[PDB]
Design an enzyme around this catalytic site. Structure first.
Site, PDB file in Angstrom:
ATOM      1  N   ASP A 121       0.855  -1.077   0.028  1.00 36.43           N
ATOM      2  CA  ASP A 121       0.195   0.007   0.121  1.00 36.43           C
ATOM      3  C   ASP A 121       0.768   1.432   0.079  1.00 36.43           C
ATOM      4  N   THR A 159      -6.861   3.323  -2.280  1.00 38.54           N
ATOM      5  CA  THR A 159      -6.701   2.128  -2.067  1.00 38.54           C
ATOM      6  C   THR A 159      -7.642   1.230  -2.509  1.00 38.54           C
ATOM      7  N   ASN A 180     -13.010   5.248  -1.659  1.00 39.90           N
ATOM      8  CA  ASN A 180     -12.831   4.418  -0.489  1.00 39.90           C
ATOM      9  C   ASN A 180     -14.297   4.820   0.321  1.00 39.90           C
ATOM     10  N   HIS A 265       1.191   8.559   5.516  1.00 35.67           N
ATOM     11  CA  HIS A 265       0.031   9.455   5.985  1.00 35.67           C
ATOM     12  C   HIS A 265       0.675  10.229   7.091  1.00 35.67           C
ATOM     13  N   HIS A 420      -2.920  10.698  -0.718  1.00 37.66           N
ATOM     14  CA  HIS A 420      -3.079  10.397  -2.088  1.00 37.66           C
ATOM     15  C   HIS A 420      -4.445  10.428  -2.428  1.00 37.66           C
ATOM     16  N   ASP A 683     -20.141  11.007 -27.271  1.00 42.29           N
ATOM     17  CA  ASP A 683     -20.361  10.270 -26.354  1.00 42.29           C
ATOM     18  C   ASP A 683     -21.235  10.824 -25.146  1.00 42.29           C
ATOM     19  N   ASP A 687     -20.338   6.990 -21.290  1.00 40.37           N
ATOM     20  CA  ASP A 687     -19.977   5.445 -21.129  1.00 40.37           C
ATOM     21  C   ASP A 687     -18.260   5.159 -21.544  1.00 40.37           C
ATOM     22  N   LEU A 689     -17.687   4.927 -24.735  1.00 44.50           N
ATOM     23  CA  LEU A 689     -18.019   3.985 -25.981  1.00 44.50           C
ATOM     24  C   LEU A 689     -18.809   4.829 -27.002  1.00 44.50           C
ATOM     25  N   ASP A 691     -21.189   6.533 -29.577  1.00 45.98           N
ATOM     26  CA  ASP A 691     -22.812   6.684 -29.426  1.00 45.98           C
ATOM     27  C   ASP A 691     -23.286   6.094 -30.947  1.00 45.98           C
TER      28      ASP A 691
HETATM   29  C1  LIG Z   1     -14.505  -1.881 -19.493  1.00 49.77           C
HETATM   30  O1  LIG Z   1     -14.828  -3.122 -19.531  1.00 49.77           O
HETATM   31  C2  LIG Z   1     -16.082  -3.587 -19.297  1.00 49.77           C
HETATM   32  C3  LIG Z   1     -16.219  -5.261 -19.151  1.00 49.77           C
HETATM   33  O2  LIG Z   1     -16.138  -5.696 -20.721  1.00 49.77           O
HETATM   34  C4  LIG Z   1     -17.035  -2.941 -20.309  1.00 49.77           C
HETATM   35  O3  LIG Z   1     -18.337  -2.888 -19.302  1.00 49.77           O
HETATM   36  C5  LIG Z   1     -19.293  -3.636 -20.000  1.00 49.77           C
HETATM   37  O4  LIG Z   1     -19.714  -2.836 -21.101  1.00 49.77           O
HETATM   38  C6  LIG Z   1     -21.103  -3.473 -21.575  1.00 49.77           C
HETATM   39  C7  LIG Z   1     -21.738  -2.224 -22.387  1.00 49.77           C
HETATM   40  O5  LIG Z   1     -21.660  -1.180 -21.870  1.00 49.77           O
HETATM   41  C8  LIG Z   1     -22.083  -3.993 -20.483  1.00 49.77           C
HETATM   42  O6  LIG Z   1     -23.274  -4.713 -21.502  1.00 49.77           O
HETATM   43  C9  LIG Z   1     -24.464  -4.588 -20.594  1.00 49.77           C
HETATM   44  O7  LIG Z   1     -24.765  -5.695 -19.957  1.00 49.77           O
HETATM   45  C10 LIG Z   1     -26.094  -5.718 -19.304  1.00 49.77           C
HETATM   46  C11 LIG Z   1     -25.933  -7.090 -18.606  1.00 49.77           C
HETATM   47  O8  LIG Z   1     -25.153  -6.544 -17.420  1.00 49.77           O
HETATM   48  C12 LIG Z   1     -25.298  -7.423 -16.163  1.00 49.77           C
HETATM   49  O9  LIG Z   1     -24.444  -8.629 -16.147  1.00 49.77           O
HETATM   50  C13 LIG Z   1     -23.007  -8.833 -16.488  1.00 49.77           C
HETATM   51  C14 LIG Z   1     -22.679 -10.323 -16.561  1.00 49.77           C
HETATM   52  O10 LIG Z   1     -22.577 -10.817 -15.265  1.00 49.77           O
HETATM   53  C15 LIG Z   1     -22.211  -7.931 -15.565  1.00 49.77           C
HETATM   54  O11 LIG Z   1     -21.004  -7.694 -15.886  1.00 49.77           O
HETATM   55  C16 LIG Z   1     -23.061  -6.630 -15.172  1.00 49.77           C
HETATM   56  O12 LIG Z   1     -22.238  -5.930 -14.242  1.00 49.77           O
HETATM   57  C17 LIG Z   1     -22.630  -4.519 -13.963  1.00 49.77           C
HETATM   58  O13 LIG Z   1     -23.829  -4.124 -13.181  1.00 49.77           O
HETATM   59  C18 LIG Z   1     -23.821  -4.356 -11.947  1.00 49.77           C
HETATM   60  C19 LIG Z   1     -25.076  -3.928 -11.263  1.00 49.77           C
HETATM   61  O14 LIG Z   1     -26.179  -4.662 -11.562  1.00 49.77           O
HETATM   62  C20 LIG Z   1     -22.452  -3.940 -11.143  1.00 49.77           C
HETATM   63  O15 LIG Z   1     -22.262  -4.676  -9.748  1.00 49.77           O
HETATM   64  C21 LIG Z   1     -21.179  -3.951 -12.018  1.00 49.77           C
HETATM   65  O16 LIG Z   1     -20.109  -3.262 -11.533  1.00 49.77           O
HETATM   66  C22 LIG Z   1     -21.515  -3.658 -13.526  1.00 49.77           C
HETATM   67  O17 LIG Z   1     -21.582  -2.225 -13.514  1.00 49.77           O
HETATM   68  C23 LIG Z   1     -21.230  -1.520 -14.680  1.00 49.77           C
HETATM   69  O18 LIG Z   1     -21.991  -1.783 -16.019  1.00 49.77           O
HETATM   70  C24 LIG Z   1     -23.215  -1.272 -15.842  1.00 49.77           C
HETATM   71  C25 LIG Z   1     -23.736  -1.738 -17.312  1.00 49.77           C
HETATM   72  O19 LIG Z   1     -24.156  -2.972 -17.142  1.00 49.77           O
HETATM   73  C26 LIG Z   1     -23.300   0.289 -15.869  1.00 49.77           C
HETATM   74  O20 LIG Z   1     -24.720   0.721 -15.708  1.00 49.77           O
HETATM   75  C27 LIG Z   1     -22.673   0.658 -14.536  1.00 49.77           C
HETATM   76  O21 LIG Z   1     -22.462   2.148 -14.359  1.00 49.77           O
HETATM   77  C28 LIG Z   1     -21.199   0.064 -14.668  1.00 49.77           C
HETATM   78  O22 LIG Z   1     -20.398   0.569 -15.457  1.00 49.77           O
HETATM   79  C29 LIG Z   1     -24.468  -6.746 -15.043  1.00 49.77           C
HETATM   80  O23 LIG Z   1     -24.887  -7.307 -13.812  1.00 49.77           O
HETATM   81  C30 LIG Z   1     -26.883  -6.125 -20.601  1.00 49.77           C
HETATM   82  O24 LIG Z   1     -28.348  -6.265 -19.756  1.00 49.77           O
HETATM   83  C31 LIG Z   1     -26.901  -4.884 -21.400  1.00 49.77           C
HETATM   84  O25 LIG Z   1     -27.635  -5.119 -22.611  1.00 49.77           O
HETATM   85  C32 LIG Z   1     -28.667  -4.212 -23.246  1.00 49.77           C
HETATM   86  O26 LIG Z   1     -28.187  -3.619 -24.558  1.00 49.77           O
HETATM   87  C33 LIG Z   1     -28.308  -4.871 -25.621  1.00 49.77           C
HETATM   88  C34 LIG Z   1     -27.480  -4.087 -26.628  1.00 49.77           C
HETATM   89  O27 LIG Z   1     -27.360  -5.291 -27.622  1.00 49.77           O
HETATM   90  C35 LIG Z   1     -29.627  -4.760 -25.880  1.00 49.77           C
HETATM   91  O28 LIG Z   1     -29.974  -5.539 -26.882  1.00 49.77           O
HETATM   92  C36 LIG Z   1     -30.365  -5.221 -24.719  1.00 49.77           C
HETATM   93  O29 LIG Z   1     -31.656  -5.351 -24.606  1.00 49.77           O
HETATM   94  C37 LIG Z   1     -30.128  -4.682 -23.535  1.00 49.77           C
HETATM   95  O30 LIG Z   1     -31.069  -3.217 -23.289  1.00 49.77           O
HETATM   96  C38 LIG Z   1     -31.941  -3.348 -22.471  1.00 49.77           C
HETATM   97  O31 LIG Z   1     -31.826  -2.954 -20.934  1.00 49.77           O
HETATM   98  C39 LIG Z   1     -31.433  -1.279 -21.121  1.00 49.77           C
HETATM   99  C40 LIG Z   1     -31.027  -1.047 -19.651  1.00 49.77           C
HETATM  100  O32 LIG Z   1     -32.166  -1.169 -18.744  1.00 49.77           O
HETATM  101  C41 LIG Z   1     -32.559  -0.625 -21.708  1.00 49.77           C
HETATM  102  O33 LIG Z   1     -32.169   0.529 -22.040  1.00 49.77           O
HETATM  103  C42 LIG Z   1     -33.006  -1.299 -23.204  1.00 49.77           C
HETATM  104  O34 LIG Z   1     -34.303  -0.561 -23.468  1.00 49.77           O
HETATM  105  C43 LIG Z   1     -33.006  -2.749 -23.003  1.00 49.77           C
HETATM  106  O35 LIG Z   1     -34.401  -2.927 -22.032  1.00 49.77           O
HETATM  107  C44 LIG Z   1     -25.586  -4.612 -21.765  1.00 49.77           C
HETATM  108  O36 LIG Z   1     -25.048  -5.531 -22.653  1.00 49.77           O
HETATM  109  C45 LIG Z   1     -21.252  -4.889 -19.831  1.00 49.77           C
HETATM  110  O37 LIG Z   1     -22.456  -5.469 -18.729  1.00 49.77           O
HETATM  111  C46 LIG Z   1     -20.201  -4.181 -18.983  1.00 49.77           C
HETATM  112  N1  LIG Z   1     -19.485  -5.115 -17.849  1.00 49.77           N
HETATM  113  C47 LIG Z   1     -19.192  -4.541 -16.834  1.00 49.77           C
HETATM  114  C48 LIG Z   1     -18.492  -5.650 -15.991  1.00 49.77           C
HETATM  115  O38 LIG Z   1     -19.164  -3.446 -16.480  1.00 49.77           O
HETATM  116  C49 LIG Z   1     -16.691  -1.337 -20.326  1.00 49.77           C
HETATM  117  O39 LIG Z   1     -17.530  -0.848 -21.320  1.00 49.77           O
HETATM  118  C50 LIG Z   1     -15.219  -1.062 -20.660  1.00 49.77           C
HETATM  119  N2  LIG Z   1     -14.997   0.296 -20.591  1.00 49.77           N
HETATM  120  C51 LIG Z   1     -14.641   0.797 -21.673  1.00 49.77           C
HETATM  121  C52 LIG Z   1     -14.518   2.267 -21.600  1.00 49.77           C
HETATM  122  O40 LIG Z   1     -14.581   0.188 -22.831  1.00 49.77           O
HETATM  123 CA   LIG Z   2      -3.606   2.273  -0.668  1.00 52.74          CA
HETATM  124 CA   LIG Z   3     -21.618   6.541 -25.433  1.00 54.96          CA
HETATM  125 ZN   LIG Z   4      -3.502   5.811   2.183  1.00 60.37          ZN
END
Ligand SMILES: *[C@@H]1O[C@H](CO)[C@@H](O[C@@H]2O[C@H](CO)[C@@H](O[C@@H]3O[C@H](CO[C@H]4O[C@H](CO)[C@@H](O)[C@H](O[C@H]5O[C@H](CO)[C@@H](O)[C@H](O)[C@@H]5O[C@H]5O[C@H](CO)[C@@H](O)[C@H](O)[C@@H]5O)[C@@H]4O)[C@@H](O)[C@H](O[C@H]4O[C@H](CO)[C@@H](O)[C@H](O)[C@@H]4O[C@H]4O[C@H](CO)[C@@H](O)[C@H](O)[C@@H]4O)[C@@H]3O)[C@H](O)[C@H]2NC(C)=O)[C@H](O)[C@H]1NC(C)=O
Ligand SMILES: [Ca+2]
Ligand SMILES: [Ca+2]
Ligand SMILES: [Zn+2]
Ligand SMILES: NS(=O)(=O)c1ccc(SC(=O)N2CCc3ncnc(Cc4ccc(C(F)(F)F)cc4)c3C2)cc1
Ligand SMILES: [K+]
Ligand code: NA
Length: 805
Positions: A121, A159, A180, A265, A420, A683, A687, A689, A691
């Site tokens: 750390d 951390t 944190n 610290h 930090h 964007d 996200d 990604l 648009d």
């Molecule tokens: C960095 O790397 C990561 C990992 O690859 C990239 O993140 C991924 O991006 C994908 C696209 O953005 C995203 O895909 C979505 O997944 C949905 C299912 O997700 C759940 O299950 C997976 C698998 O177990 C899990 O990983 C997810 O975890 C997220 O959510 C939980 C909370 O529930 C959190 O604990 C976790 O930290 C994580 O949160 C993050 O992602 C969510 C979005 O998932 C954000 O909102 C958070 O802020 C946070 O960043 C989930 O538990 C899936 O349902 C989505 O599908 C929709 O889109 C398709 C398009 O084809 C469509 O056909 C479907 O119909 C569907 O749309 C419907 O739902 C919409 C919302 O209600 C609605 O608008 C529509 O009208 C429809 O009803 C989608 O595919 C993927 O899950 C994340 N994965 C992770 C781990 O984050 C990331 O982009 C990379 N970053 C860069 C900059 O490249």
């Molecule tokens: Ca630390």
């Molecule tokens: Ca976007």
């Molecule tokens: Zn510290």
């Protein structure tokens, strides 16, 4: 409720946790107030300390001792780590000359080289040099193995976000550990450093290394350690687990140390008090390595020595207070310190306005030591927006400072001298990486890299398929001797059209004018060839970018530039041009100030129109290829094509024009030519990604011309600056940016001055990786070079940071 009446007899540091009310004996039981009654007695023995002594050699086995020196200890797997040196005349690992590990040399029954991650750390990058004299074990790892000069953490440089990033390969916005301290509004629940809410699994997203391994049949040691378990006991426990039967033995292990963060610290990063904790960490490394040597695993295990973040000098007198800016300071809740996150105190207060909070915090004091941002306006390199746990209003705090709400928060909480959490490009925030082992390279320095990339490597090291993450798999292949990951380039999804002349000038009713009615077989064939791509080799040096999504677009060639023009977005996706060291900069001629020209290759229906810009009183336009860098008065006309125009706010045009008129030429002079690829980004949902069309929130008034949220430029040249960019035989050098397309320059407090006093400063803040731009555009760059794909992947992850050495 815990029935603490059961026993830890034969279960000390059990890997499989048990479910309440049954009492625990695993390495988090203390943290949960759940350990069985006899855990301390049995599992936390300390008798006679941690080191064999001459007298203890051959002793009778006293089960009470913390470790053993009796003849049977090596078979039980529980000798003190110096046993062989003290009793059996062996040397400490650190006294041994280093010898290349060409192959794993493992005991029988070992199915892969184990991995042990040794996390520290607050281990600032410069300690490797500044503390070298007191860290001999770490220095040996560093010099014999593979190391980077530094490893870049994620933002915020705290951390929990960083350790979880190490374990997942994800940005904090995606794994959900965004600081944190956190409030999740959907849960209506708060995460804290203290207490029990942090233990609910719903906070921790993604799939961490230990879950990845277990799901694929690789057993894992537990990565969390209760604070009160001393370091020596942690090390002995890892060594005990390494003596388990083959079918029970983990293949991945982690050690965590709270030092040197804890003392940093208190004393600041280089306080005289810091030497001893550095000494103590080194001794712990030595115990681990001596223990591995005892087990004949020192040339079998891969060891990673990695930090989560660095540490900066921060004292309580360097604090800004929001009560000195805001009238309604009681109406907000601040997450304070080295970053700020603001939201309303009551969701029922409808007089809450972010707009007025931002205005009251923007450039109000000459020396202001923070800057406010709506989170979507943060530098894209921070990837810190797309999570409901990140508050809309963010404060980026200057290094060395804190922000607090009121003075009383500081003295009813000077105590501390380091902290930090700042911008991850800050030099003091940088941390360390060393890899030592049969799978790592020998005596190898690699360039700095980001900690998001390590999860993939840890997966490679264990023969695991990584879960989807934000690393770029293959970008760290140069760290490894073997087990490298060989990806293929992604397939192009849309192929371009190559339109010729299809429209007469009079078919266009765009409301544009140009003073260009000025009329030779010598140069008439020549201009034809330029439109057919004859100079493209000059201007498209690394191939056309591949479009990785379904869309409709045209390639347009010109004398000075090449473009990929979207029929859907009505503007280029990318524009590519090369400026030599000898290029001359010219002005836009008086007669062409407002010139815009129909492109006879592109239908009026797929073109922008000048009348929309005229009627939109807010929006103006600029050009992607800059008319200032035209190769000749005649070629300059290409630059005023409607197919080279993009929407620009007048405030932005100040930035863009200075970039184009001054900075491009400056870079070409400095780098011996540059190749430039520029373009729009959309964007709107922040996200990270690209648009799709239906996500676009703003259009040029009265038209279907979408407004970009950002403009990018990728600026490439030869790493060997003795060779011109357009005739480079070897590795490339890149710098890129993603500039926010804002209707004001409120971000730049000096913006009333000449662009020489603030534009390059802005640009530096919004430096980017090529990979950031790829995510944002759906484009794949550098498709046609003479370099290996892994080398190109490393280039695409490069961030030009602008910090000193
Ligand atoms: C960095 O790397 C990561 C990992 O690859 C990239 O993140 C991924 O991006 C994908 C696209 O953005 C995203 O895909 C979505 O997944 C949905 C299912 O997700 C759940 O299950 C997976 C698998 O177990 C899990 O990983 C997810 O975890 C997220 O959510 C939980 C909370 O529930 C959190 O604990 C976790 O930290 C994580 O949160 C993050 O992602 C969510 C979005 O998932 C954000 O909102 C958070 O802020 C946070 O960043 C989930 O538990 C899936 O349902 C989505 O599908 C929709 O889109 C398709 C398009 O084809 C469509 O056909 C479907 O119909 C569907 O749309 C419907 O739902 C919409 C919302 O209600 C609605 O608008 C529509 O009208 C429809 O009803 C989608 O595919 C993927 O899950 C994340 N994965 C992770 C781990 O984050 C990331 O982009 C990379 N970053 C860069 C900059 O490249
Ligand atoms: Ca630390
Ligand atoms: Ca976007
Ligand atoms: Zn510290
Ligand atoms: N401790 C308190 C803070 C903390 N925060 C998040 N995750 C974890 C688990 C963890 C542990 C170790 C690593 C690494 F591989 F780098 F060694 C990676 C992750 C921890 C552990
Ligand atoms: K206008
Ligand atoms: Na300003």
């Amino acid at each position: 409720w815990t029935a603490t009446s059961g026993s830890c007899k034969g279960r000390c540091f059990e890997l499989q946790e048990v479910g309440p009310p049954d009492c625990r004996c695993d390495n988090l039981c203390k943290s949960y107030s759940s350990c069985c009654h006899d855990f301390d007695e049995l599992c936390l023995k300390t008798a006679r300390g941690w080191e064999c002594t001459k007298d203890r050699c051959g002793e009778v086995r006293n089960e009470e001792n913390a470790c053993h020196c009796s003849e049977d200890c090596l078979s039980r797997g529980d000798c003190c780590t110096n046993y062989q040196v003290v009793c059996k005349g062996e040397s400490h690992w650190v006294d041994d000359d280093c010898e290349e590990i060409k192959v794993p040399e493992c005991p029988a029954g070992f199915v892969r080289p184990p991995l042990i991650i040794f996390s520290v750390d607050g281990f600032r990058a410069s300690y490797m040099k500044k503390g070298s004299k007191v860290m001999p074990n770490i220095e040996k790892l560093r010099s014999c193995g593979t190391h980077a000069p530094y490893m870049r953490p994620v933002y915020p440089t705290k951390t929990f976000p960083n350790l979880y990033t190490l374990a997942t390969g994800l940005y904090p916005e995606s794994h959900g550990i965004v600081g944190n301290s956190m409030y999740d509004p959907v849960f209506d629940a708060s995460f804290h450093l203290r207490g029990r809410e942090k233990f609910n699994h719903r906070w921790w997203g993604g799939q961490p290394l230990w879950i990845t391994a277990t799901k694929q049949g690789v057993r894992a040691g537990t990565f969390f350690w209760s604070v009160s378990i001393p370091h020596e006991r942690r090390i002995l426990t890892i060594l005990q687990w390494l003596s388990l039967p083959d079918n029970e033995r983990p293949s991945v292990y982690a050690f965590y140390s709270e030092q040197p963060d804890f003392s940093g610290h208190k004393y600041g990063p280089f306080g005289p008090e810091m030497t001893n904790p550095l000494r103590e960490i080194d001794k712990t490394v030595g115990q681990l390595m001596d223990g591995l040597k005892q087990l004949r695993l020192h040339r079998c295990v891969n060891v990673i020595f990695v930090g989560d973040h660095g540490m900066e000098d921060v004292t309580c007198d360097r604090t800004e207070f929001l009560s000195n800016y805001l009238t309604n300071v009681d109406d907000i809740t601040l997450v304070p310190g080295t970053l700020g996150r603001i939201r309303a105190k009551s969701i029922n207060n409808s007089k809450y306005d972010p707009k007025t909070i931002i205005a009251a915090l923007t450039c109000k004091k000459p020396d202001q030591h923070f800057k406010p941002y709506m989170k979507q306006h943060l530098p894209k390199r921070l990837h810190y927006a797309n999570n409901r746990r990140i508050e809309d209003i963010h404060l980026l705090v200057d290094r060395r400072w804190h922000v607090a709400r009121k003075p009383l928060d500081v003295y009813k909480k000077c105590f501390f001298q380091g902290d930090h959490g700042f911008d991850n490009k800050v030099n003091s925030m940088q941390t360390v990486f060393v890899g030592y082992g049969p799978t790592f390279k020998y005596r190898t320095k690699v360039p700095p890299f980001e900690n998001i990339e390590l999860y993939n490597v840890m997966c490679d090291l264990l023969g695991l398929k990584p879960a989807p993450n934000n690393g770029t798999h293959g970008s760290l292949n140069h760290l490894l001797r073997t087990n490298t990951f060989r990806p293929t380039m992604p397939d192009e999804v849309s192929r371009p059209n190559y339109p010729g002349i299809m429209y007469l000038q009079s078919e266009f009713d765009l409301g544009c004018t140009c003073d260009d009615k000025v009329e030779n077989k010598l140069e008439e064939l020549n201009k034809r060839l330029h439109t057919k791509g004859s100079t493209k080799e000059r201007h498209l040096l690394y191939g056309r970018p591949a479009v990785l999504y379904r869309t409709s677009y045209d390639i347009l060639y010109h004398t000075d530039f090449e473009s990929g023009y979207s029929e859907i977005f009505l503007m280029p996706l990318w524009t590519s041009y090369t400026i030599s060291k000898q290029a001359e900069v010219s002005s836009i001629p008086e007669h062409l100030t407002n010139c815009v020209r129909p492109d006879v290759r592109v239908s009026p229906g797929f073109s922008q129109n000048c009348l929309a810009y005229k009627n939109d009183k807010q929006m103006s336009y600029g050009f992607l290829f800059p008319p200032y860098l035209s190769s000749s008065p005649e070629a300059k006309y290409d630059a005023f094509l409607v197919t080279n125009m993009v929407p620009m706010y007048p405030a932005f045009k100040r930035v863009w024009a200075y970039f184009q008129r001054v900075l491009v030429k400056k870079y070409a002079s400095e780098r011996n030519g540059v190749n430039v690829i520029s373009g729009p980004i959309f964007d709107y949902n922040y996200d990270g990604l690209r648009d799709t069309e239906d996500e676009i929130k703003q259009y040029v008034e009265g038209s279907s011309i979408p407004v970009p949220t950002h403009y990018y430029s990728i600026i490439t040249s030869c790493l060997d600056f003795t060779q011109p960019a357009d005739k480079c035989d070897g590795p490339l050098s890149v710098s890129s940016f993603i500039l926010p397309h804002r209707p004001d320059n409120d971000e730049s407090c000096n913006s009333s001055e000449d662009e020489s006093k603030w534009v390059e400063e802005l640009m530096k803040m919004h430096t980017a990786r090529v990979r950031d731009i790829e995510h944002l555009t759906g484009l794949d760059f550098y498709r046609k070079t003479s370099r290996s794909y892994s080398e190109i992947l490393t280039l695409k992850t490069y961030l030009h940071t602008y910090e000193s050495e």
